Write a protein that binds this ligand. Structure first.
Ligand SMILES: CC(C)c1nc(CN(C)C(=O)N[C@H](C(=O)N[C@@H](Cc2ccccc2)C[C@H](O)[C@H](Cc2ccccc2)NC(=O)OCc2cncs2)C(C)C)cs1
Lengths: 99, 99
């Protein structure tokens, strides 16, 4: 299917057993979710964006369902204002930009 | 054209006579450029990002060529690591996300 950009491209995801809404974001290298618990080891990281930087925890090999399809990759967790699905997971679903 | 997302979706733009690089960003409502000179008056705007909020200058009705296509719209100028083409201008080109 085709997703329009007249509105924010927000989709439902399932991660860590929880259902959430998240923004499909071609301008994000990585996926960043509002603070939550995830299984396994993690390492601290600083990620930068428009307002400056925030400290997050990086969990690797985390499974996520997006649009029902199951993908796996790195997920950063911390005080982000909204959940963001980055290119690292978008590629796994075969997403492209077209015009 | 079709753009995959294994690397950052960077395109060439032309604004105020100058060629620049910019990131195609579906997760951005608006277009934000690094400090530069633009004609006309500006008005104040606060935009929010991952790191919080920042003051930018809002210039309305600015012509930009993106991939040689002319768009005319609002451009925000302020502190940013990268020029960002947001949904306001991506919609003028007819960009969609597809999988
Ligand atoms: C130039 C160099 C430093 C670059 N690094 C990168 C890799 N990096 C750091 C990222 O992708 N970082 C992501 C990001 O913020 N990307 C950004 C572009 C950018 C990149 C680097 C530095 C500054 C801005 C752009 C992202 O789409 C974010 C997503 C978002 C949306 C709402 C709330 C929080 C976040 N969009 C926004 O910040 O919107 C700003 C707004 C515009 N108009 C109204 S609000 C994080 C979410 C992970 C790309 S270019």
């Amino acid at each position: 299917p085709q997703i329009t950009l007249w509105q924010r491209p927000i989709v439902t995801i399932k991660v860590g057993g929880q259902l959430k809404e998240a923004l499909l974001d071609t301008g994000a290298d990585d996926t960043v979710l509002e603070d939550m618990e995830l299984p396994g080891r993690w390492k601290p990281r600083m990620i930068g964006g428009i307002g400056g930087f925030v400290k997050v925890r990086q969990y690797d090999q985390i499974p996520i369902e997006i649009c029902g399809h199951k993908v796996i990759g790195t997920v950063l967790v911390g005080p982000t204002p909204t959940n963001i699905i980055g290119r690292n997971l978008m590629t796994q679903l075969g997403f492209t930009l077209n015009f």
